[PDB]
Amino acid sequence: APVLSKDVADIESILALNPRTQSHAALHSTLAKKLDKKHWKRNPDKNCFHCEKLENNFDDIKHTTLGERGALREAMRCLKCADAPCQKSCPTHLDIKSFITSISNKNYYGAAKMIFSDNPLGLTCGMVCPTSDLCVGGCNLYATEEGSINIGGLQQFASEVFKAMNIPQIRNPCLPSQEKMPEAYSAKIALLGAGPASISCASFLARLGYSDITIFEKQEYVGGLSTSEIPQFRLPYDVVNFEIELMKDLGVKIICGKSLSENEITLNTLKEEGYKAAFIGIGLPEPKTDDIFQGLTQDQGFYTSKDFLPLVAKSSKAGMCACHSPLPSIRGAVIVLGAGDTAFDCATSALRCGARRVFLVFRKGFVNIRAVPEEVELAKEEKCEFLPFLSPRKVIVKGGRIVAVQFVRTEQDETGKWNEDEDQIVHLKADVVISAFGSVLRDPKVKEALSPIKFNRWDLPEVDPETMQTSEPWVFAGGDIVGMANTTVESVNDGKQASWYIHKYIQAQYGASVSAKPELPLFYTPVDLVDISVEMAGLKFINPFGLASAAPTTSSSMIRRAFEAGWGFALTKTFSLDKDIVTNVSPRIVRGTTSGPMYGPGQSSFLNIELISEKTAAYWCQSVTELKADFPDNIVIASIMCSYNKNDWMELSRKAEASGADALELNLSCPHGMGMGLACGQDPELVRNICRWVRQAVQIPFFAKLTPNVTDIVSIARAAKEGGADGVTATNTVSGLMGLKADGTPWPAVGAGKRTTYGGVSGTAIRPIALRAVTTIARALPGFPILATGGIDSAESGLQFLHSGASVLQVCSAVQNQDFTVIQDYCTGLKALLYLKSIEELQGWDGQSPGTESHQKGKPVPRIAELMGKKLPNFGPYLEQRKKIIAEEKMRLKEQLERKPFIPKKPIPAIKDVIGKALQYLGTFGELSNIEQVVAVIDEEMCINCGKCYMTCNDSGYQAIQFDPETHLPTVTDTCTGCTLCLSVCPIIDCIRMVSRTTPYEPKRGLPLA
Amino acid sequence: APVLSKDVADIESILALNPRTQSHAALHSTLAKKLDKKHWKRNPDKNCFHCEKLENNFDDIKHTTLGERGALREAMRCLKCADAPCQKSCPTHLDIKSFITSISNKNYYGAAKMIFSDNPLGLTCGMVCPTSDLCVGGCNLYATEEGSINIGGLQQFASEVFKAMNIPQIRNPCLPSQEKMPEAYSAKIALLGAGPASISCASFLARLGYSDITIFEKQEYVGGLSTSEIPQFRLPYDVVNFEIELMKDLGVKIICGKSLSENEITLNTLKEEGYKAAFIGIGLPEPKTDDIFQGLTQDQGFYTSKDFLPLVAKSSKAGMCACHSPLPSIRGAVIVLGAGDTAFDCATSALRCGARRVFLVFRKGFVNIRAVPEEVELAKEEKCEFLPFLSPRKVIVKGGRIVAVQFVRTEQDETGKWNEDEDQIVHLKADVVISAFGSVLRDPKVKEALSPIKFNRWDLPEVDPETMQTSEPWVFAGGDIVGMANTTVESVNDGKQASWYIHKYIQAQYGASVSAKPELPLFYTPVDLVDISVEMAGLKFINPFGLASAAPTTSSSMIRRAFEAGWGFALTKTFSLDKDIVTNVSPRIVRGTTSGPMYGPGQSSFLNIELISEKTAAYWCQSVTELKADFPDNIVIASIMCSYNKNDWMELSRKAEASGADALELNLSCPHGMGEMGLACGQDPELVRNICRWVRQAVQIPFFAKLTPNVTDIVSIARAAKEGGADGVTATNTVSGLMGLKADGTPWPAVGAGKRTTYGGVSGTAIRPIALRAVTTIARALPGFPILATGGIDSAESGLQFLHSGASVLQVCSAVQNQDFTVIQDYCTGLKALLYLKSIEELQGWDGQSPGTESHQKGKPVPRIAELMGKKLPNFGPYLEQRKKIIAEEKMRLKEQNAAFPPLERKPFIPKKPIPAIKDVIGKALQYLGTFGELSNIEQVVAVIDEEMCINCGKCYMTCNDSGYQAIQFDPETHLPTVTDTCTGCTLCLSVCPIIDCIRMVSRTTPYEPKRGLPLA
Ligand SMILES: O=C(O)Cc1cc(=O)[nH]c(=O)[nH]1
């Protein structure tokens, strides 16, 4: 008999890289280290003077782009601040707190909805907004070592998920039907330029109800700058189209080929044609030119941002123009004049055109570059060179082409003025020159078409900063054309700003007034129509979510706000008869240590030694009458508690019913009085009796709130059904101790004696318990009403309890970790969930989570043949090979889809249709098939080489994984048993997956059987 | 009767900023936004062209510095990878995975120990290592949106906490007593230069046992470059002293004032004096000079890094020079020639001296700057200007002061060669010039003192890259002097590398040989002597940690490795008689959703539908015999399980004892198929008592009953087992629960195409609150009755919590499923530290290994400036502007004082009481537990916020608003909270505050009066 407790040679070999603590310090010469360091390099080599080749490489280079996995973490990291500063720093006032809350809750739709409600170009802004100088600039978390929240990427993600769902926009469902709309709304509205400004504007105008909105775009393409100049590698043209279509869904009309200039469209022709109001949003169409570049042409090698960028655009953006154009042939040293943010897109774009080298030359110093840092960094990392303090003077042309640019040094004196020493000339070689000095409105033909609107000193139309109204009442402008906005988000806000007032004006013209306070509509989709109401025990809940008798319902005042927020129902904190008045101690509510030293938002649990309500039954019953008086459709349930005494239970239960309570909830946490547990809720007999007393006392339905601290909850659940209860609430907090300091003292620690008692654990940490409890009671007493409580904190989790047999969902800890508004997330979230169950083309998704696609850092993994199954991890020499292979592919491709909405191909389920549907899958252990075994399969393309799966299987598994010592890539061997631990600890979602075993399974007995 | 369910005017006002969802889109003009944006600005203004004044401001500017709260997050974020690449990228091979794991477990000492075991200059390296180019460069987490782990900061922190503990170093406790050490070790060893290289080297040499080690430092100060040049705002001099002292604890001797020169100290004088071996670590003492700077002097405004930096050092580093040193007066435009990393310390430092403007001028392009990025950004952000493609040619002087520097343009031709166009001259104004072209060894007096060692073509001593041995067998070199190392960490490693071989050589000279495989000692402290053994039920545990009957013990082969790792004891996966052989399904083990969508390390729980062992009792029993045969001191406990049948329980239980098992554990998870206390045996006291009786009469070795938590009263089953004869109980097993469903309603784990499942067991940290109660409750009911705790143990500290609650030994599982067997090292060194600190009087304000939290921001202490406290200036917008002004004013004030700052008094903390032993702490926490009635409701408290620590999120505000008593005011301009007198001390806010110890509960000074809503009759 070999030595059973010793690894065989084969296995000892497989464990070669498994962690083992050393007994001595390691010896490795500095030289050996140097040589070896290059193998694992993951980031840029500061000693590398080049970088891969980027010719015709328009892959997304944004550092902010996030994948689901990563979106969820950051979303969870967000503090979700009150009166958040990031929103104050956002041009369109996006409720960041809210949409980010929705994301951490996996309610992407809700998040997407919140973003587009205030920003029609949500997806685009999330990709281009210079967040560092806007929202992220005020991020509270900037005051932590970890830093500010990547608001931008988070917005990008939620919007992207939403776009993928293929849901159309729809007018507010509350608006009167088309025909019933006042005359005023049919006025002909016109917008010039299909840019952010105009797209934003027309959208809001359409939301308000206006039926005749037309946008006149000069070019053949829409989207303005977002299409004509911003790089494909920063903002995909596909995104623009997405947002444009969303607009069209509301009827907005776009007509390309029409321009605003004398002989074409003019304020007069429009007035003459019957247009009641017009929004000018053509931006700054022409490049800022300079003398020294006169006569120069593209053939020679001269461009202006306005010339260059649009060419690369049209070339790299499939769908922009019908004509597939070439990618400008830029070879040799390129010189971009200027340090504006545009200058940098030119620089980086130039490299995609084949530029050998690119120099950014500005007339000031480095510290004077006012382009957003994030933008500069891209250039700098793609190895663009910088040359400061140089002002252009001459473009030396020899042989019909440019060969050099002549500069002159600049310098800043005491007073802080800039001088140019005309003595110190400078010759810089150059094969191409691109000037990024800016854009303006010069064309007198256009300037005229705007007569007689008054122009300011900047030679731009003048508008009231608040109304966006020009000198002519029916004419408003906004965006770049006005000169205030320096961003997409700001121009979008301009269109938006203007929309309201254009509305105010048009209405006035029809002798109609508008509210005093601005009421621009929110964003709406068919999802918002889904019905999430439910009936339980004869009670009609407008929506399944409610506040559970706890902290969130300490005062009736709170419940009121709760209802105002939109909560389906609520429980009054548990109250009792005067003789049982209680008095709380302090501290009494503490955070959970169930998830480690993680402080802030999203605590995995709480523990509390708080007693019932300290407020009198008088207070509560009055409060109940009040509440039900002002909120007749919100269900109010009174939570009452009495000792084991029939008269008491009947007295109190009648009093509550008398106040108007829709129903009652019996708090069975009181002591029996003799030494099953100490509490009433633990003894079936007692439970049954208390339930009888109340049954005979009142007529309104009442439910028993069961405790989970019992050997069999189904028995007390049954005893209450036998006692007359109309349903059970499952479950109350799990008893436990939340911890001790190193000194042995507890927490909470009451009084100077630092004492405490067993408290109740609430939160996500007890969901597994409440869930079992609900699913067990649901199979034992089918149909019997269950109000679930315990770890519900999102629409998805709440759906889980519905699927487990619950009809309504109680919440507490989730609101202690946040606030009443989460209700908005819950409803919009549950709606989305049910709505998606009707979309056939989206069955590969898990709720609102699309199917995970092989990606690295959130961005997809290139499907190049020369890369697949080559075992090239993303580090060291392997990464070098990857980049080459990828560049080779781009060059090969250089040598080388209608957006329709998804229609529900089935009726949208209703709460009742989903309650308990998950029960079918539950069974005993014997009903689980042990012939249908599985094994783990790793996707090397998604793996981050941590080796976690390796270690789990090594010290908690079957040593069935090989971990290459050079590529740090894992490979599950066929000794795998499919326990599923690895998958469980993989830090990359869906990198590891369980698949059906193809070979015969044979248990490991160690020693054969007799 | 006012309207009770309506907020009164005052409260509606207090809720003004409370969140409420909007009904319509927001209307805010683009202009209004612009004006408002500057009020919340937190980060730099891309439009502002000037960084606050930094004159005489040597505060820490490192972006990596971490505080405990922050260190704990990052530590937890670390994947703690296998064969970690970051370690491979570390020149000292620091077991990063391990020390970061210890940090995440609050075991700072263990962390600190690990780091110093491989890097005697741990604290320094953690602050200066150019991680981007080293360890961090290969961090797997770089492949995530969040990015690579701040290894440097993590090391800094652990080191910093350790330094605070004031614990001395001691020689390997397993080395023979001083007098019993061979002659060889008394050899006179000498090292030149008290720099990182030498400091590391001597240290290791001293660790090996050598008793005569002396370092000859030229200057009057120690620490080398780390003292003379690296900025105080990057590396505080008192860190250097800390590490030097740690060395001295090992006997190493340092003598300043002695130099290695042809006049005084030389290889020959040393040999003649009797020194058996010498290590050269003098670095590159001289600055690289250029002709164009001939004749220029400091008075004119010229310096070389070697001239300038040491001046600012001596002036800004209290404790370096005893003498009072003037802070160089640098006014006007400064020009730093070079783009080396030193060039940048010069730029930043220059600002501290009062420079009005600083220009970094290099002869190549921006892409050609070879300084690590983190270092470059420092300058860039303090607004230093850059001027590329310029080579110096002449320095102009007028009045005897510099006033300009003449340059010539440079450029690259298509062949990649750099040319300097002598025609294009450049006049650049300048009041001061500092050349940072590098350092070298030229002084022929020194080069001579090294005769006859052979020099290579770089004009530096030549040494075997592996042995660090020069042409002369008794002489080794390392660090900068050799020319390979570019970092502190690398020079440390050189000293280290050289140490071993110096060892090998010295031994040989005494006719002794050394192991084939290098055995450099680890780092040791008195804490490592702490005794963490414990006796329970007659069994002697070498340490209380052990593997609980589960996955980590699926095969005896694993238990073996576990013992090899050092685990005190282990449980065999539960096994039964042949007739009860089981077969598992799959999937069967899944991650917990108890902590949200957090994937990777540190799972809050696991749920599993795994049955007992699939391996035969034959296998186990032989395995037990083999295990106990090889590991006599490691307790092996067999976990057995049989139906409710006396013969079986007695058969199996005897077979187990027969194999040699130290004790047995009864798995009472088999059903008792008898009608209607649930279905399992462990849920019925009668059945538990009986099974315990059967086993009591069958065997003699102690056995325990592993109680299940899924019972209405666990104490009853615990008593029933004590009555049945058991020698103790294990508490508790997994909690029954369902881990969740997908959107489609199907569960997970989902077995078969039918996607079915059953109620599984929840394990991990998510059930610790249950297991702890279970333990503390059985501990008070049956005092003295042995309890083997199990349920959420994942660190020394948590383990100590179960000892404090009455458990004597701690079982582990989920924690190893989340990691691996080596966690044991963390646990032991952790528990050690804990008990050890309990005897230190001066560290009572701490909570275990956590120092008392100090008012901070982003991990840095808050300046206690009189004109800054209670002024309500939050760290954002114009308030931040005022703060910075007030702080610069304070620095200028401090300069006008020129007060010399008293030297360093680093004295070790001595245990002023015997170090407790496990027995001395078991159950000590039980005294505080009581009923609710024993809780005083007259000793009420309220929350009090530290505005200096607050990050203005407003979470406390929202908790108290929708889950509290609307007791907090949240200013609309400073976003600073203020708890009012309406507070009841519920403590929810403190619970949700994201900043540790920002909110604290204090004794209520105003009388407490419960809110009844409506008065009583
Ligand atoms: O146990 C807890 O944590 C909270 C609680 C207190 C109480 O009196 N009743 C109840 O149902 N729950």
Ligand code: SF4
């Ligand atoms: S000692 Fe330096 S090179 Fe090594 S793990 Fe630490 S910070 Fe990285």
